Amino acid sequence: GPHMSTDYWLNFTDGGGIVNAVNGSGGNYSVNWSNTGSFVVGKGWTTGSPFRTINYNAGVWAPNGWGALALVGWTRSPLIAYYVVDSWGTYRWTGTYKGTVKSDGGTYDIYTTTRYNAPSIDGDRTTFTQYWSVRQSKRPTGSNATITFSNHVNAWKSHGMNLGSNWAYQVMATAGYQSSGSSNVTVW
């Protein structure tokens, strides 16, 4: 797989509440958020790859409510958002259950959902399918961790979940919805 450090900084908020993101040095970033709408912040790559290995270390992981410490990315053709969720806050991300995949010392549940009239890389009010791998139990944080994304791509394919042909961003993110928290993450 590719061996390139990060080149992309993502800082998205729909404007609800407070999302105080810091674009740190190298692969490092932090977020403190409060009473938010929908947001996603992270570091990664402008063009995703199905062969990338993402390394990270979350030195601070302190979400509440809906929060996700997750690989986040998109394809176009078709427009699909995907997620590999290693940890979360109060509520565990789920959807339509498809199966499981083992990767990087964890077992992940595979889900699909669909969003309507929602923000995406194509506009503020769009419809798109979402593919999820969600760890069955929260991954420990504070030590170096790996996501071998190809294992997820392959398992998704085995359940009829095919990604699009045009790769957009691919980041190791802090995402949340209607919540509050803190994170500090370094990505490579």
Residue numbers in the entry: -2 to 185
Quote the authors verbatim.
Fentanyl is a potent agonist of the μ-opioid receptor (MOR), with an affinity of approximately 1 nM and a potency 100-times that of morphine. Custom-designed ligand-binding proteins offer the possibility of both detecting and counteracting toxins such as fentanyl. Following the placement of the hydrated fentanyl into the binding pocket via PatchDock, RosettaDesign introduced 9 mutations to the Fen49 scaffold to optimize the protein–ligand interactions. Fen49 was designed to bind a solvated fentanyl.
We solved an atomic resolution (1.00 Å) X-ray crystal structure of Fen49 in the apo state, one of the first examples of an original (non-optimized) computational design that has been structurally characterized. The Fen49 apo crystals were obtained from a condition containing 25% polyethylene glycol (PEG) 3350 as the precipitant. Soaking experiments with fentanyl tended to crack the crystals and destroy X-ray diffraction, likely as a result of PEG being displaced from the binding cavity. This, coupled with a lack of alternate crystal forms, prevented us from obtaining a structure of the parent Fen49-fentanyl complex. Purified Fen49 displayed an affinity of 6.9 μM for a fentanyl-Alexa-488 conjugate by fluorescence polarization.
